[PDB]
Amino acid sequence: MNTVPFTSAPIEVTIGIDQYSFNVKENQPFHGIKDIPIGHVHVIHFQHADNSSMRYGYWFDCRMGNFYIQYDPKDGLYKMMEERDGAKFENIVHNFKERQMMVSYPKIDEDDTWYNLTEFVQMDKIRKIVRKDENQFSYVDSSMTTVQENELSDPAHSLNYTVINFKSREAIRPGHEMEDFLDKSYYLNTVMLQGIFKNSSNYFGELQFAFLNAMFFGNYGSSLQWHAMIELICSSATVPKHMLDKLDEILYYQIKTLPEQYSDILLNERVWNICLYSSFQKNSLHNTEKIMENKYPELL
Amino acid sequence: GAMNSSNYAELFNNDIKLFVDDTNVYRVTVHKTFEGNVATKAINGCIFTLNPKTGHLFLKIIHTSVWAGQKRLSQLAKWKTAEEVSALVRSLPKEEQPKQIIVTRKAMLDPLEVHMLDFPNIAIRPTELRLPFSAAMSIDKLSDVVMKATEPQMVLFNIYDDWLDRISSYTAFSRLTLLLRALKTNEESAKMILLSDPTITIKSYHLWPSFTDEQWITIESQMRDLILTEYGRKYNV
Ligand SMILES: NC[C@H](N)c1ccc2c(c1)OCCO2
């Protein structure tokens, strides 16, 4: 189990770690998060009490370095930093633990939720979507635009998701216009899986990462990407059977975790009704259809 | 965006544009089968592609053989229309290619957009005008060429005959839409109006009769009366 210490907490803030969250009062003696499960990526995220504008946060993997949080009063945010002095780091963590100044990652033994949401998410793929090569961790916030959003404005601060556009020459073979527009299997299997992602695990990793950024930051372009990647599969008549089964599991856990009161802003009614009730795969998403109907029957 | 009564003079500016109407592409008669079921029989159709400024009509005849062994024909018809319009554009010299294509039915937007991805600078637009181009097959010489076709064929017409030597495009389009609306509403009575007087004929190289300027005024009035008469019959007014 690993630890992200905090130098201090000078401003009142809601801190998230993965799907958990807790409130820290201004100048309260908070010095970090311990017992973080090794083996998964994680995200530590922030929403200031005095200015809920900008949710922001950091994706990281404790196997790749020793990371900590320190507030910067000039830029006005909690920043992740890497500590290269390993013996300094262990000494700081040990002291804070001895004084019980850290919260414990509150995972229930029975609970696979975080694994289920991040099964295909790897730090290396995150770092290609979020480009800041000098850090081993990746910053995301609520306002960051996607590359495709910037084509339709600072490129260094963009989310480089794979562009999906159903009315593009990439999606549509000359001479197969009707075929390729009504059945997206070419675009899914040849262009995206074989050509760009190389395999379905990388496709699902980006889909899962887009969902989590939508949910944790309210990032609108991430929500667009998540829905586009679902629609591309559902609108394809020919999809490897293992992919359909795994997509159903992925979406089930996403819908299960979504905060009920955020459903109006995180779910696209058109996409979900098309995917569940009209698409080629309308009968291939049994678990997802069941939770959607029991949890969000209004959307449908 | 869409095209309506606010920007109606835009049709007659100097940017090349084409209307595309697909309502006569897939034409069927429905009839009873020997077992008491119902079956369709297709007949030849056409794509109606019109330049409203010049009157040039590119009439692509859709021969029934294009439907043989195909499914979901009403859907296929839209994609076949888009394929043929795209082919037409590619056949035109660059300086003759349209800057806008206006479809009469919004269901044509995505098929045409997808077929025209190679032409990102040609705008594909709907219209809020209700245009009576479905009545094109009430023009005898157009109906004749379509029904006689034994293979796919493109035939070029000027739907204004020689009117543009005496009137503006705006006025020619208004005359055309009034004629077509009257033929759509009551084809028999409209044709009676157009041919009642044996001394006025249709030139071999024309679609409509050779009316003088004063006779066109009379004809147009009789067409308006027909439309109003039929509106009164329909709604009991
Ligand atoms: N080619 C110019 C255009 N078709 C036009 C406009 C007005 C006219 C006219 C011709 O004939 C003379 C009287 O009114």
Side-chain angles (χ1 to χ4, degrees), chain A residues 101-119:
Chain A
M101 318 234 75
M102 306 188 158
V103 298
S104 177
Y105 182 86
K107 190 188 173 289
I108 278 336
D109 293 326
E110 175 207 33
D111 185 19
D112 273 350
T113 291
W114 189 243
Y115 171 78
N116 288 335
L117 294 169
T118 60
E119 177 176 358

Side-chain angles (χ1 to χ4, degrees), chain A residues 208-220:
Chain A
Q208 286 179 318
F209 186 60
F211 171 74
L212 295 164
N213 286 326
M215 179 173 62
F216 289 131
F217 304 113
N219 184 273
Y220 182 79

Side-chain angles (χ1 to χ4, degrees), chain B residues 27 43-46 59 61 135-149 157 187 191 207:
Chain B
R27 295 209 287 166
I43 59 155
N44 291 344
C46 59
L59 194 71
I61 305 184
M137 292 293 94
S138 294
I139 300 171
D140 286 328
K141 283 182 195 195
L142 303 190
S143 180
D144 283 354
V145 68
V146 168
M147 292 312 288
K148 295 179 206 299
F157 295 92
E187 181 181 22
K191 293 187 176 191
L207 297 177

